[PDB]
């Protein structure tokens, strides 16, 4: 009566939960940029987009985000985010290590330079070659922080 | 050097070395650190890396084999009371400040 | 440090990484302008004119 | 364990400097730091914690 | 530092193998991957520089 | 009934506690230099505590201070101090790492010497070269111990 | 090598190297291997001995 170890386990596979982790340093930085910095707002498209499996492939169905853990653990300084995903064919199993991409704000008046136009010289320091009004060429040190698709989201320069 | 500027046969003699200068000798209490569960090689490796810029291994940069160095940031080693800003880890997983 | 649930600490949360100097002891300048250079000695036994 | 305690407590460690380079702007204090030196007397070797 | 890096990485090794060069004393050195640690952020995750 | 592990957890995020460790030698030196010799005299602007987040952003509201553990830890050698903070927006989460800024007394009007003039000599304590009204160089023995900016805070001499 | 084969003053011009060949590059997922509990030194000690 009331012994510790189980004798079997029953489980439901539809729907499925995805517990991702996010560092709180990138969580309050989002709240800092969401009011004073590069202003942005998602809207009704902040439900979710899909996730990425173990082999790097993409899941066909997208999920939904409802939050479940406002608490920072001491070892890593990271909060936990819960998401619910439909699993009609049991392609997802409990315990799999996955990568879910969430939705940050929507940046307006964003500048996206192509990959071949940007280079990295000595001391790192990502730069590009521009043409001014006198048809000269200049080198501009830019602050390219992330890649979106086939472009770099450049924020200065 | 007391009998140096007085001599008429010699002029502008000087030591080619440098004059003595102050230096900061810190002493750790190995009895108290060992009673606090702190290993001593951890204290040695903390003070050798965090202030003394240890050398880890090599890396490649534009096809040339260069180095990677490890040291604390500039604003954490400028003053003698900044040395209390560093922490070691004792054997039960807690963090001990350096001025303990 | 990576926990089994996916939380992790990378080397941008405890440090800041960048290409700096190997040694910061010696530094030169030329007529006020920032400059560096290599001073060339001579091996003994070899002629200093060629 | 004795050979490990001796090799951990009888060392000479490169500690560093109190105003070393690259320093913060406006630094005026500069002095080398004397860490743990090697042991000299026999009573210093008798006082090694096992 | 960039001038010293270019002097070391490009012009030092040709100038170090000609007739009569026995020593060179370049002011500054090449680049290095400097990793500056933060003691507060190291304390926040229970880590050491080791 | 009365099992160990919980089923869920509910927490209250307004106000919030900040628990802060301070080594026992620090308060021992502080209470040595406070009530004897040197003048500290904290003086009723001492319960105010402002805390700084991990990204260096100053939290806008201030909070009180209320001590709650007069015992040092045998492992770390530190005493715990406890503070309250208003959290009306839930910007702070339980488990975050912060930096509290206490005020350890306010020294009165005395003295602050520059670091270029104060030096070390005579195999021990600190010295400084002063001139008298007769324009003679006189050596003085100082008791400088700590640094404010590029200045020593001297106490004697 | 093709601008030399059109020149009539030379014959049997060739390199003394070797032709390029396929190489099997394996990548490991350090995030996944550390989340599974496998330490990253053991992966190097396995692939460099086996």
Tabulate helix, strand, coil % of chain E (nearest 5). Answer: 30, 15, 50
Q: Which residues contact B66 (CB under 8 A, 6 or more apart)?
A: B58, B59, B60, C22, E30, E31, E32, E33
Q: Compare all CA atoms of chain F with the CA of D27 and give the residue at the minimum distance.
A: F150
Q: What tokens were used for F23? A: 């080594």
Residue B48: inside a domain: yes
B85–E39 CB contact, under 8 Å: yes
Restricting to F residues 44-83, those with a Cβ less than 8 Å away from any Cβ of E are 54
The alpha-carbon gap from D20 to the nearest alpha carbon of chain C, in Å, equals 9
Cα–Cα distance measured from residue G24 to residue B58, given in angstroms and rounded to the nearest whole number = 25
Residue B11: inside a domain: no
Total residues belonging to chain F:
157
The answer to whether C3 faces chain G, any CB pair under 8 Å, is yes
Q: What tokens were used for E48? A: 């050491």
Q: What tokens were used for C7? A: 């939380």
Q: At what angle do helices B40-50 and D2-9 cross, to 10 degrees?
A: 30
List residues of chain D with CB under 8 Å from any CB of chain B: 8-9, 11, 13-20, 22-24, 27, 29, 31-36, 49
Match 């309250």 to its residue by tokens: F84
* Cβ-based contacts under 8 A for chains B and C: 5
Q: G15 burial class (0-12, 13-18, 19+ CB within 10 angstroms)? A: exposed
Give yes or no for a contact between A117 and A92, defined as CB atoms under 8 angstroms apart. Answer: no
Q: Which residues contact B63 (CB under 8 A, 6 or more apart)?
A: none
Give yes or no for a contact between A133 and A148, defined as CB atoms under 8 angstroms apart. Answer: no
Give yes or no for a contact between B78 and D18, defined as CB atoms under 8 angstroms apart. Answer: yes
Q: Compare all CA atoms of chain F with the CA of E44 and give the residue at the minimum distance.
A: F97
Q: b/e map of D10-28 (b: 16 or more CB within 10 Å)?
A: ebeeebbbbebeebeeebe
The alpha-carbon gap from B15 to the nearest alpha carbon of chain E, in Å, equals 24
The answer to whether C7 faces chain G, any CB pair under 8 Å, is no
Give yes or no for a contact between F100 and F20, defined as CB atoms under 8 angstroms apart. Answer: yes
Cα–Cα distance measured from residue B49 to residue E48, given in angstroms and rounded to the nearest whole number = 10
Q: A131 burial class (0-12, 13-18, 19+ CB within 10 angstroms)? A: exposed
Asked if chain G contacts chain B via 3 or more Cβ pairs within 8 Å, the reply is no
Cα–Cα distance measured from residue G7 to residue G11, given in angstroms and rounded to the nearest whole number = 9
Q: What tokens were used for A1? A: 């009566």
Q: Which residues contact F91 (CB under 8 A, 6 or more apart)?
A: A28, A31, F59
B61–C16 CB contact, under 8 Å: no
First to last CA, chain A: 71
Q: For residue C36, give the 3-state DSSP assignment.
A: coil
Between C23, C40, C46, which is nearest E29 by CB? C23
From chain A, pick out residues whose CB is under 8 angstroms from the CB of C21. Answer: none
Between D16, D27, D36, which is nearest B44 by CB? D36
Residue B10: inside a domain: no
Question: In Å, what is the CA distance from B55 to each residue of B64, B66, C23, E34, F74?
Answer: 17, 11, 12, 10, 35
Q: What tokens were used for D20? A: 């070393």
CA atoms within 13 A on the CB side of A107: 14
Chains that touch C (3 or more CB pairs under 8 A): A, B, D, E, G
Q: b/e map of F136-148 (b: 16 or more CB within 10 Å)?
A: eeeeeebebeebe
Q: Method of determination?
A: cryo-EM
Residue B81: inside a domain: yes
For residue D47, which phi and psi values (nearest 5 degrees)? -95, 55
Q: For residue G41, give the 3-state DSSP assignment.
A: helix
The alpha-carbon gap from B25 to the nearest alpha carbon of chain F, in Å, equals 12
Residue B93: inside a domain: yes
Asked if chain E contacts chain B via 3 or more Cβ pairs within 8 Å, the reply is yes
Residue B8: inside a domain: no
Q: Quick one: residue C32, left, alpha or beta (phi over 0 = left, psi -120 to 50 = alpha)?
A: left
E44–F99 CB contact, under 8 Å: no
Question: Peptide bond before A153: cis, by omega within 30 degrees of 0?
Answer: no
From chain A, pick out residues whose CB is under 8 angstroms from the CB of C1. Answer: 75-76
Greatest distance between any 2 Cα atoms in chain D? 47
CA atoms within 13 A on the CB side of B93: 3
Q: For residue E40, give the 3-state DSSP assignment.
A: helix
Helix (H) or strand (E) holding F128: strand F126-131
Q: Where are the alpha helices (DSSP H) in B10-100?
A: 30-35, 40-50
Question: In Å, what is the CA distance from F119 to each residue of A60, D17, D25, F130?
Answer: 72, 17, 21, 12
CA atoms within 13 A on the CB side of A136: 5
The alpha-carbon gap from D9 to the nearest alpha carbon of chain C, in Å, equals 29
Residue B7: inside a domain: no
C25–D22 CB contact, under 8 Å: no
Number of domains in chain B: 1
Top residue of D21, D25, D27, D32 to mutate, by most chain C CBs within 10 Å, is D21
CATH for B72? 3.30.2090.10
Q: Compare all CA atoms of chain D with the CA of B33 and give the residue at the minimum distance.
A: D49
Cα–Cα distance measured from residue F50 to residue F46, given in angstroms and rounded to the nearest whole number = 11
E45–A77 CB contact, under 8 Å: yes
Cα–Cα distance measured from residue A116 to residue G11, given in angstroms and rounded to the nearest whole number = 40
The answer to whether B12 faces chain C, any CB pair under 8 Å, is no
Give yes or no for a contact between A148 and A112, defined as CB atoms under 8 angstroms apart. Answer: yes
Cα–Cα distance measured from residue A113 to residue A115, given in angstroms and rounded to the nearest whole number = 7
Give yes or no for a contact between F96 and A72, defined as CB atoms under 8 angstroms apart. Answer: yes
Residue B5: inside a domain: no
Top residue of F118, F121, F150, F153 to mutate, by most chain D CBs within 10 Å, is F150
The answer to whether E40 faces chain F, any CB pair under 8 Å, is yes
Question: In Å, what is the CA distance from A125 to each residue of B61, C12, C22, E31, E48?
Answer: 14, 17, 18, 14, 30
Greatest distance between any 2 Cα atoms in chain G? 66
State the virtual CA torsion across F49, A25, F55, B94 in degrees, nearest 10: 60
Q: Compare all CA atoms of chain E with the CA of F52 and give the residue at the minimum distance.
A: E40
Q: For residue A118, give the 3-state DSSP assignment.
A: strand
- β F50-52/F78-85 pair status: unpaired
Q: Compare all CA atoms of chain A with the CA of C9 and give the residue at the minimum distance.
A: A76
Cα–Cα distance measured from residue C2 to residue B92, given in angstroms and rounded to the nearest whole number = 19
Give the residue numbers spanning the domain of B82. Answer: 21-100
Q: For residue G5, give the 3-state DSSP assignment.
A: helix
β-partners of residue F51 are F100
Asked if chain D contacts chain G via 3 or more Cβ pairs within 8 Å, the reply is no
Cα–Cα distance measured from residue E48 to residue B86, given in angstroms and rounded to the nearest whole number = 9
For residue F36, which phi and psi values (nearest 5 degrees)? -150, 130
């Amino acid at each position: 009566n009331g012994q510790a170890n189980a004798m079997a386990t029953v489980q439901q596979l539809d729907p499925i939960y995805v517990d991702v982790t996010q560092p709180s340093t990138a969580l309050l930085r989002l709240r800092r940029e969401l009011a004073s910095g590069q202003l942005e707002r998602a809207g009704d498209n902040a439900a979710k987009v899909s996730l990425k499996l173990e082999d790097g492939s993409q899941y066909p169905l997208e999920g939904r985000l409802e939050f479940s853990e406002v608490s920072v653990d001491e070892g890593t300084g990271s909060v936990t985010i819960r998401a619910v995903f439909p699993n009609p064919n049991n392609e997802l199993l409990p315990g799999m290590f996955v990568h879910a991409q969430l939705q940050e704000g929507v940046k307006q008046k964003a500048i996206l330079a192509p990959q071949q136009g940007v280079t990295r010289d000595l001391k790192g320091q990502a730069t590009a070659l521009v043409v001014n009004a006198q048809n000269k060429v200049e080198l501009r040190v830019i602050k390219a922080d992330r890649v979106i698709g086939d472009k770099w989201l450049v924020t200065e320069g | 050097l007391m009998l140096a500027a007085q001599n008429p046969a010699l002029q502008r003699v000087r030591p080619n070395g440098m004059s003595d200068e102050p230096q900061y000798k810190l002493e750790i209490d190995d009895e108290k650190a060992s009673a606090l569960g702190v290993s001593l090689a951890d204290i040695n490796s903390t003070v050798s890396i965090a202030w003394g810029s240890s050398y880890v291994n090599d890396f490649i940069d534009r096809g040339r084999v260069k180095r990677v160095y490890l040291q604390g940031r500039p604003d954490a080693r400028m003053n003698p009371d900044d040395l209390s800003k560093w922490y070691v880890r004792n054997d039960k997983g807690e963090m001990v400040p350096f001025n303990a | 440090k990576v926990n089994p649930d996916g939380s992790q600490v990378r080397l941008k949360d405890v440090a800041d990484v960048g290409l700096g100097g190997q040694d910061y002891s010696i530094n030169a300048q030329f007529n006020g302008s920032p400059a560096s250079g290599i001073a060339i000695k001579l091996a003994t036994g070899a002629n200093a004119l060629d | 364990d004795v050979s490990s305690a001796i090799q951990a407590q009888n060392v000479q460690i490169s500690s560093g400097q109190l105003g070393g380079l690259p320093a913060v702007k406006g630094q005026q204090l500069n002095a080398t730091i004397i860490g743990k030196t090697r042991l000299q007397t026999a009573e210093q070797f008798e006082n090694i914690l096992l | 530092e960039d001038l010293s890096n270019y002097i070391v990485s490009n012009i030092q090794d040709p100038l170090s193998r000609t007739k009569g060069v026995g020593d060179f004393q370049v002011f500054g050195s090449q680049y290095s991957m400097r990793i500056w640690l933060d003691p507060a952020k190291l304390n926040s995750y229970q880590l050491t520089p080791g």
